[model samples]
Target: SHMLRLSAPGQLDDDLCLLGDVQVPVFLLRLGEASWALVEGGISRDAELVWADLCRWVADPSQVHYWLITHKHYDHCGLLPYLCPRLPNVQVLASERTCQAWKSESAVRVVERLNRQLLRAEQRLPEACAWDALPVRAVADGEWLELGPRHRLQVIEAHGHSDDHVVFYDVRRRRLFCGDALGAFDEAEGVWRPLVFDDMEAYLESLERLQRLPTLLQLIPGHGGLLRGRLAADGAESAYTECLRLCRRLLWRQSMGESLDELSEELHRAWGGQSVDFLPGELHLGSMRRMLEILSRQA
Candidate 1:
C-alpha cells in the first residue's frame, strides 16, 4: 500500500522535517546540537519555500552541515546551486557517479534548460547561477557519513533508477532515505512510474537487495507520501514488484514498435497529467528511451 500525498508539509518525525510545498520534498534531519543534515536539495520551484521553511522550522541555514544529493537528477539537486552560497557551512555529498554526472557539460545544460522551463511554467524564471566547480564530495558505498556524535548515514549504492543514484541509511533509526531508487509512485494510488531508465538488471537487483534489510521503521522516499507502519514494512518489495511489472510491459510494447515518445505520452495520461511545465514530457520520453536502450542491450 504505497501512498502518494497532497498533505501539508511539516515535521512528520521527531528529528526529520519535510520541506517543499508539494510534489518532491526535502527532508531535514537534526544530527546533533548544532548540525543538521539535509536529505535532498529539492527542486527549483520550491527554492524559496525551502529557504523559508529552513529558517522557520529548522535553525538558520548556517547550521546545515551535510547536504546529501542522492542522485544527479535535475529535480533532486535543482536547488543546490541556489542554496550553495547561502549555506556556507554545508558540504554537499553524493556518489562518485553522481559527481561525474553533474559535471557533464551536456547534462548540466539539460538541467538548466529544464529548470528554466519549470520556472517559466510557474511564471518566475530567474537568472541561472554559475554551477561550475560545485564541491560535491563523492562518497563511496558503505562509507559512513558522520552526521553528529551518534547519528550517521551509511551510503548505500542503489543504482537502478540511475547509475549515479545512492540511498542513505540510518543504521540506528532504520530509516532508509531511498532517493527514487524505488521510482515515483502515485501519491495515493499504487500506480508506479517505473523509472528504470538506466540499468534495468541493476535496478531490479538493487530492489531485491534493499528488500531484505531488517527492522525498517520508515522509508524516507524522494517523492510522494511518508511511508511508515505497514507501508514501510514492505515498501521495498512493493517497489520491486511494480518496477519489474512496468519494465516488462515496456519491453513488450517496445517490441511492437511503439515509439518511446508515444509510450511516454500514454504514461503521462496514465500517471496523472500535471502539465508539461511541471513534470516535463521530455523527462518521460527520456526515461522511456533510456530504458528501451538498456533493454535492447540485453538482446
Candidate 2:
C-alpha cells in the first residue's frame, strides 16, 4: 500500500521508488483504462510487502493476475518463491532460459541459497513467514499478454545481460520495460546506458532491437529509477556500453593476436585510469574474458 518513489526519497530525483532493500524498483503501471499491473519485483525479501500492497489496491481477491520476472538473476527472481504462495491467484511468468536455469542443478542450489539468506534477513517480516513451493510459466519473444482490454505486454528479446533477459513493452502508453537488456540508468542525469553485458554481439543486437520499440519517454529499469526521455539527448553512457565498445576494440586487437591482458592494460593506461573505475567490481574482467572468448570462437 506504500510507495518508495525516487523523487520522494530525494536520493534520486526521478519518477521511481526503491521498495526497502530491494535492488530493483517495483512500479505500479497503468497500462490502459482501469487496468494496471505491478512491474518486476526487486531482490530477495523486498517482495515481502508486495502481497499486502496488492491486497490494498483491489480491496478484493486476485488484484494482480500476473507476476513477471524479467530474468533469472538472483536480484530479480530470488523473492518469487516467497511471494508466489502468498499471491496464489497471480501466475508467475519468466523467460525460458530462466525457467530452465531455475530447474538446473547449478541454479536450484543458487536459488535455495539465495532464498535462505533473504528469508533469514526478513525473519521479522510477515511475508517471509510463509514459504511454499512456487511454480512458474515461461515467456517468449513477440508474445502478447493482455492485462486488460487496452493494456498489453509485448515481450522483447533482450539478451546480453543474460540469455533470458526480456523487455516488456506497453504499446498503448509508449513505454518500454527495458530490463537488463537496455542496461541500468542513473536518473540524476537522465541516461539509458549499459551495465556489464555478458555478450557484446547479442547486447549490441539487442540495443538495435530496442530502437524499433515504442516511443520511450519513460523507463522503469531494474537497478535505477525511471529514465526520462530518449538516450540520444541524455548523453549518459551506461558502464556496460562503454565497456562493450572497449571489448569490441579489444576483440579486434586480440584477433591480431594481441595479448588480452596486455591490451586491457594498455587501454587502461590510455584512458589514464578513467576506464578502471568499474574494474574494482570485477564484472568488467568477466565481460572482457567473454569478449576474448567470442574472438577465439569466431576465429
Most accurate candidate by TM-score: 1
Q: Point out the worst 10-residue segment of candidate 2 by lDDT.
A: 1-10
Global lDDT of each candidate: 0.75, 0.57
Candidate 1 stretches with Cα past 4 Å from truth are 1-7, 121-129, 251-264, 272-277, 296-299
Each candidate's root-mean-square deviation in Å? 2.9, 6.4
Q: In model 2, which regions exceed 4 Å deviation?
A: 1-23, 30-36, 51-58, 114-133, 187-193, 231-245, 248-299
**Tens digit of lDDT per residue, candidate 2, span 125-221?**
3444222245666788989987776667788887877888888887766666676676544343343434434566677777766766545655556
lDDT of 1 by residue, 198-282 (tens): 7878888988888878767787777764777666767788888887676677678878988765666566567635324456776
Clash-forming residue pairs, model 2:
1-53, 4-17, 6-16, 193-238, 194-238
What's the CA error at residue 226 for candidate 2, in Å?
1.3
